C-alpha cells in the first residue's frame, strides 16, 4: 503494498523508510499494528 496508504502513516515511500534499521522498521511497524 500500500505504498498509497504506507506512506500516510509514516508521510514517506517505502524506499525511505527502508531506510532506518532493519530491526527499528519491524519496532514501529509492529507497534503501529502492521507487520
Request: charge should be negative; avoid cysteine; hydrophobic fraction near 40%.
Given at each position: 503494498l500500500s505504498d498509497?496508504?504506507?506512506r500516510a502513516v509514516f508521510?514517506?515511500?517505502?524506499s525511505a523508510?527502508?531506510?532506518?534499521?532493519?530491526?527499528r522498521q519491524?519496532?514501529?511497524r509492529r507497534?503501529?499494528?502492521l507487520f
Open positions: 498509497e496508504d504506507f508521510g514517506m515511500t517505502r523508510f527502508a531506510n532506518l534499521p532493519l530491526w519491524q519496532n514501529l507497534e503501529r499494528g
